[PDB]
Amino acid sequence: PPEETLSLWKREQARLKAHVVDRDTEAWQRDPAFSGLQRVGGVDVSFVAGDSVRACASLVVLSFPELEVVYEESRMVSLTAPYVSGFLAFREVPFLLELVQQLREKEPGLMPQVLLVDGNGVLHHRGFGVASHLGVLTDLPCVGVAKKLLQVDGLANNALHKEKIRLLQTRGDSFPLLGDSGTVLGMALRSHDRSTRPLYISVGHRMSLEAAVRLTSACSRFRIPEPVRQADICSREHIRKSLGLP
């Protein structure tokens, strides 16, 4: 894309990042068992294999703590914004925001109290990933749940990182991800007793990192937390139906 587009995207990230709230704002977030939390949402965008434009965007809502799907919606979309590392949210957030608003008007009684986002929050090139960008615009508590480590602010998958993973033992075990300067950007979380590869959790909006990590653990029946896993499944199924794939 033109340099003017990146410059204005950077400025919009800065505008919105100033609205990120990196503390807990709801009583349910400050309770050990999340008393008062009833619905947790999950979001996904998945590209059609062999394509960088056509994709499926999905929103699911699950009951908590039962983790049963109570709402699901998937839509095929065309991601026409250019792809630039550090700016993925500009491709994906428009469609996820539209799904949340459709829910808010169609069935407000099913609105999630928090979203688990397949993507990063403040652990990001500019401290403002998809989870933070979606969180600020929806004004919903949002957690970034990433399956791989984004190597930003001096973070690296190095010998130290691998030894810290070795010392993770069970579901719920976690260690902090410290930016080169001293800002903790997220946590690596072992989400399942039988998997060694952690998830990388960071604040999106309106949650503390400690609470976000605990919520992600509470939502994990398998390695991928249930709201994220169900949104991924919904997108894959919708693509296969829409394109007639066996």
Report the interface residues with Na ion, using CB under 5 A.
Answer: 38, 64
Instruction: Please enumerate, as own/partner, the contacts of 154-159 that have beta carbons within 8 Å and a separation of 24 or more.
Output: 154/179, 154/180, 154/181, 155/123, 155/179, 155/180, 155/185
Whichever of 30 and 241 has its CB closer to Na ion, that residue is 30
- The least CB distance from residue 164 to Na ion, in Å, is 10
Q: State the residue number with the nearest CB to Na ion.
A: 38
- The least CB distance from residue 101 to Na ion, in Å, is 24
Whichever of 6 and 165 has its CB closer to Na ion, that residue is 165
Whichever of 49 and 166 has its CB closer to Na ion, that residue is 166
- The least CB distance from residue 40 to Na ion, in Å, is 9
Whichever of 162 and 181 has its CB closer to Na ion, that residue is 162
CA-nearest of 81, 193, 169, 186 to 131 is: 186
CA-nearest of 136, 137, 76 to 101 is: 137
**How many whole angstroms separate alpha carbon 118 and alpha carbon 230?**
11
User: Does 44 count as an annotated binding residue?
Assistant: yes
- The least CB distance from residue 168 to Na ion, in Å, is 5
CA 5 from centroid of its chain's CA atoms: 25
Residue 164: CB atoms within 10 A of its CB come to 15
User: Does 173 count as an annotated binding residue?
Assistant: no
* Residues placed in the known binding site: 44, 118
* Residues placed in the known binding site for Mg(2+): 44, 118
